[PDB]
Design an enzyme around this catalytic site. Structure first.
Site, short mmCIF file in Angstrom:
data_model
loop_
_atom_site.label_atom_id
_atom_site.label_comp_id
_atom_site.label_asym_id
_atom_site.label_seq_id
_atom_site.Cartn_x
_atom_site.Cartn_y
_atom_site.Cartn_z
N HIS A 129 -4.41 -5.79 -1.67
CA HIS A 129 -5.16 -5.59 -0.45
C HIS A 129 -6.16 -6.69 -0.19
O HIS A 129 -6.77 -6.77 0.87
CB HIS A 129 -5.91 -4.26 -0.47
CG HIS A 129 -5.02 -3.04 -0.37
ND1 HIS A 129 -4.13 -2.71 -1.35
CD2 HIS A 129 -4.97 -2.03 0.58
CE1 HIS A 129 -3.53 -1.57 -1.02
NE2 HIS A 129 -4.04 -1.16 0.17
N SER A 135 0.86 -1.19 0.00
CA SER A 135 0.00 0.00 0.00
C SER A 135 0.91 1.26 0.00
O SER A 135 1.95 1.33 -0.70
CB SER A 135 -0.89 -0.03 1.26
OG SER A 135 -1.90 0.97 1.21
N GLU A 180 -0.79 -2.65 -8.38
CA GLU A 180 -2.07 -2.92 -7.74
C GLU A 180 -2.66 -1.66 -7.12
O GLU A 180 -1.94 -0.76 -6.75
CB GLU A 180 -1.91 -3.99 -6.68
CG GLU A 180 -1.14 -3.55 -5.46
CD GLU A 180 -2.02 -3.05 -4.33
OE1 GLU A 180 -1.51 -2.35 -3.46
OE2 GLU A 180 -3.21 -3.36 -4.30
N1 LIG Z 1 -11.37 1.07 9.61
C1 LIG Z 1 -11.22 -0.01 8.81
N2 LIG Z 1 -12.19 -0.96 8.67
C2 LIG Z 1 -12.04 -2.04 7.86
N3 LIG Z 1 -10.91 -2.26 7.11
C3 LIG Z 1 -9.87 -1.36 7.21
C4 LIG Z 1 -9.95 -0.16 8.06
N4 LIG Z 1 -8.80 0.54 7.91
C5 LIG Z 1 -8.01 -0.15 7.03
N5 LIG Z 1 -8.66 -1.27 6.63
C6 LIG Z 1 -8.19 -2.34 5.72
O1 LIG Z 1 -6.78 -2.34 5.58
C7 LIG Z 1 -6.45 -1.63 4.41
C8 LIG Z 1 -5.54 -0.52 4.89
O2 LIG Z 1 -4.59 -0.50 3.88
P1 LIG Z 1 -3.79 0.84 3.56
O3 LIG Z 1 -4.45 1.96 4.38
O4 LIG Z 1 -4.00 0.97 2.03
O5 LIG Z 1 -2.44 0.21 4.06
C9 LIG Z 1 -7.73 -1.09 3.82
O6 LIG Z 1 -7.83 -1.13 2.40
C10 LIG Z 1 -8.70 -2.09 4.34
O7 LIG Z 1 -8.47 -3.32 3.62
#
Ligand SMILES: Nc1ncnc2c1ncn2[C@@H]1O[C@H](COP(=O)(O)O)[C@@H](O)[C@H]1O
Ligand SMILES: Nc1ncnc2c1ncn2[C@@H]1O[C@H](COP(=O)(O)O)[C@@H](O)[C@H]1O
Lengths: 332, 335
Positions: free
Chosen positions: A302, A111, A234
Site C-alpha cells: 500500500h 489489498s 503484505e
Molecule cells: N478516504 C481515504 N483517504 C486517504 N487515503 C485513502 C482513503 N481510502 C483509501 N485510501 C488509501 O488507499 C488504500 C485503500 O486500499 P484498500 O482499501 O486496502 O484497497 C488505503 O490504505 C489508503 O492508502
C-alpha cells in the site's frame, strides 16, 4: 497458459468488488482514468461504477456480474480493481473461471482484491498480478504515480527477457494525504529493502495481502502452498496485535515449514502499539529462530510507489543481496 | 462411545487465571480486582498466572512467556478451572507450545471467550475434551450488578450444579451491550427486554462447534481447528465489527463449504455492531451470503460479548429448535 501483454490502445476493464470508491472519491477516480487515457489506454467502466451501497458497491450477485461481464468481454485486455475493501471473497463462488481460462487476460489489483487474484490463479492456473488498483494507484499525484506507472509498464507491456529483475524504487511514501486534492507534497522517504535474514530461495511465489488471505484460507480459492514456494505477504494500516495473529496463523498452519523464503512488503501506517517494534521483528518472534531468508520492506504494497508482481511464477529472491528476479514467463 | 470430561466445578475450587493476549490485569485494575472479589465472595480461590499485573503494550508478554503462564496452570493438579482474564488478538500464538498431553492426563474446565476461542478450540481439537465458551474473568465477572449475577447463575448451573439431560439453556430475560461501567459505575445499564430471533425455521441436532468467528480465521486450516463435520451445529459470534468485516467472515465460511455441512446455525448477539449505514442486521448479511440455501438459524443468542453471558459447552451434541427458540445440551460435558 498465459495472458497477452498489455498494448497501447488496449481496453482496461475496471470493476469494484468491494468499496464503492468510484462514488465516494470521484476526483481521484477521474484523475486515475485521465492518467491512463493520456497514456493511451481505454477504460471500460464496470456496471457498478458510480453506484453506492454504503460499505460496498452492490449485492454479491451484482458484483459477480460486474466482474464476469469484464471477463467475458473479448475487447478487454486487462481487468483492474478500482479499490480494495473487505468483500472480494464474496464473489468467489460466482466467477466465470472457465471463461477466464479459455481467454486469459491480465488480472491486476491488490489489498482485498487478493481474494480474486489468488482465486483465479487457484482455479485456472493462470498467473495474476499484485499491482495497481485504479483509484489508489493511478489517482495518486505526481511524483509517485509516475514510478508506479513505470513498474506497471515494465511488468505488463514491455518485452522482458528472463530472468526479469525487479528493482527497488529510490523513494517511497505511506503518507496519508493528497487523497482527493493535493495539499502539501509527500515526503520522499529514502528507500531500503531490509535483509532481515540472510540467504537465497527460488520457487513459485504465492501471497498478496495477508489479512485478506485469511478470508479465503482453506477454500478451493486459495492455492495450496507447496514445499519450496516463496511466501510474499503484505499488510497495511493494521496494528501489532493484528499482524502477530496473522503471522501466527501462518506458523500454525505449517506454512513456514514449507516455504523456502519470505518477501514482506512495507506496512502502510503501521501502528506498533507503543512497542517500537517493526513488523519483521514480530514475524521473527513467531519464527522462533527458524532460518528462512527474509527480505522486508518490499515495495509491492500500500505504500507509493508500487511494483507490479506476477503471482504463481518461479521467482529467485536473495535476502542478503536484496534482489528479486522473476524466472519464468508470466505473459505472452 | 463415552469420552474424557473435566470434573465439575466445586465450591472452594481454585480457578487459574491467565492473560493469553491483552494485559487487562494491568490496564483495568479495578474491574480485575472487582472480578476477583466477586468470585472470591462466592467461595472460589483464584490462582493468578505468572503474567498477572505484567504489561507488554498490546500483550501481557512474549509468546513464550504466555505459553509458560498457561502451561503452569495446565500442569498444576490443584487447579480445577482455567479461565482467561480477557481476549485480544494473540491467543493463537500459544498453540504450538501448549502442553496438550498434560491437559489430557488431568482435564480441567477450560473457559473463556472471544480471542480465547483459539485456545478453546485448539485444546478440544488436540485432546477431544469439551471446552467452554463462557466467562472470561475481567469482562464477565467484573461486570457490575445486576448482569454479573445472571452470568454467574449460568456459570454455576452449567459447571457446578448437577444437570439432567437434555439441559435447557434458558433465555436471559434482560440484556445490554452498553459500553459504560467498565472501571467504575456511572449509572444503571438499561435492562433491555431480551428475545432470541427465529431467523429461519427448523430444527437441528448435532455436535456444536464454534466460538468467535473472527478468531476462528486465525486458526483455520491448522491442527488446532477441529474439522467441521456433516451434521454439526455452527455456533458463531462476533463483537464490535462492521458489516464489511462480517460479510467477509461469512463469505469465508461459505467458500470453505461450511454451510454445506452444518445442520443449523446459532448466531450470537453482536456487541456494538456498526452496520455502516445499511440498517442491516448481522443475520441479514449472513442470509445474503447463504443465498438460496435454507438452514435453520437462531440468532441473538446470549453467548457473546453482550451481557449477560451464557456458558456453553463446545464439542457436545446439542439440539437447536430455531422455530421455537430453544437450545438443549444433549450429552454430558462434565463428570
Ligand atoms: N478516504 C481515504 N483517504 C486517504 N487515503 C485513502 C482513503 N481510502 C483509501 N485510501 C488509501 O488507499 C488504500 C485503500 O486500499 P484498500 O482499501 O486496502 O484497497 C488505503 O490504505 C489508503 O492508502
Ligand atoms: N475500556 C473498555 N471500555 C468498555 N468495555 C471494554 C473496555 N475494554 C474491554 N471492554 C469490554 O471487554 C470485552 C472483551 O474484550 P475481548 O475479549 O478482547 O473481545 C470487549 O468486547 C468489551 O466488551
Amino acid at each position: 497458459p498465459l495472458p497477452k501483454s498489455l498494448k497501447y490502445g488496449d481496453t482496461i476493464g475496471i470493476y469494484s468488488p468491494s468499496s464503492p470508491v468510484t462514488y465516494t472519491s470521484p476526483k481521484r477516480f477521474e484523475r486515475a482514468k485521465s492518467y491512463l487515457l493520456q497514456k493511451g489506454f481505454h477504460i471500460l467502466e464496470g456496471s457498478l461504477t458510480g453506484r453506492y451501497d454504503y460499505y460496498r458497491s452492490g449485492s454479491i450477485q451484482e458484483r459477480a456480474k460486474e466482474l464476469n461481464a469484464l471477463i467475458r468481454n473479448p475487447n478487454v485486455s486487462c481487468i483492474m480493481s478500482t479499490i480494495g475493501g473487505m468483500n472480494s471473497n464474496s464473489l468467489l463462488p460466482y466467477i466465470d473461471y472457465d471463461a477466464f481460462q479459455n481467454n486469459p487476460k491480465i488480472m491486476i489489483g491488490y489489498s482485498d482484491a487478493t481474494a480474486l487474484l489468488l482465486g483465479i490463479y487457484a482455479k485456472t492456473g493462470i498467473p495474476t498480478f499484485y499491482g495497481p488498483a485504479l483509484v489508489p494507484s493511478f489517482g495518486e499525484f505526481e511524483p509517485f504515480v509516475d514510478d508506479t506507472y513505470k513498474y506497471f509498464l515494465e511488468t505488463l507491456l514491455h518485452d522482458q527477457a528472463l530472468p526479469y529483475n525487479i528493482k527497488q524504487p529510490l523513494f517511497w511514501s505511506d503518507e496519508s494525504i493528497n487523497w482527493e486534492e493535493k495539499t502539501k507534497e509527500k515526503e520522499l522517504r529514502p528507500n531500503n529493502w531490509i535483509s532481515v535474514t540472510n540467504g537465497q530461495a527460488t520457487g513459485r511465489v504465492i501471497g498478496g495481502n495477508l489479512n485478506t488471505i485469511q478470508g479465503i484460507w482453506g477454500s478451493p480459492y486459495m492455492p495450496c502452498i507447496q514445499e519450496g514456494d516463496i511466501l510474499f505477504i503484505e499488510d497495511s494500516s493494521k496494528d501489532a496485535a493484528t499482524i502477530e495473529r496473522s503471522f501466527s496463523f501462518l506458523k500454525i498452519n505449517g506454512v513456514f515449514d514449507k516455504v523456502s523464503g519470505i518477501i514482506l512488503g512495507k506496512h502502510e501506517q503501521f501502528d506498533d502499539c507503543g512497542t517500537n517494534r517493526k513488523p519483521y521483528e514480530i514475524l521473527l518472534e513467531v519464527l522462533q529462530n527458524q532460518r528462512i531468508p527474509l527480505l522486508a520492506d518490499f515495495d509491492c504494497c500500500h505504500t507509493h510507489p508500487m511494483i507490479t508482481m506476477p503471482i504463481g511464477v518461479q521467482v529467485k529472491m536473495d535476502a542478503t543481496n536484496k534482489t528479486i528476479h522473476i524466472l519464468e514467463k508470466w505473459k505472452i
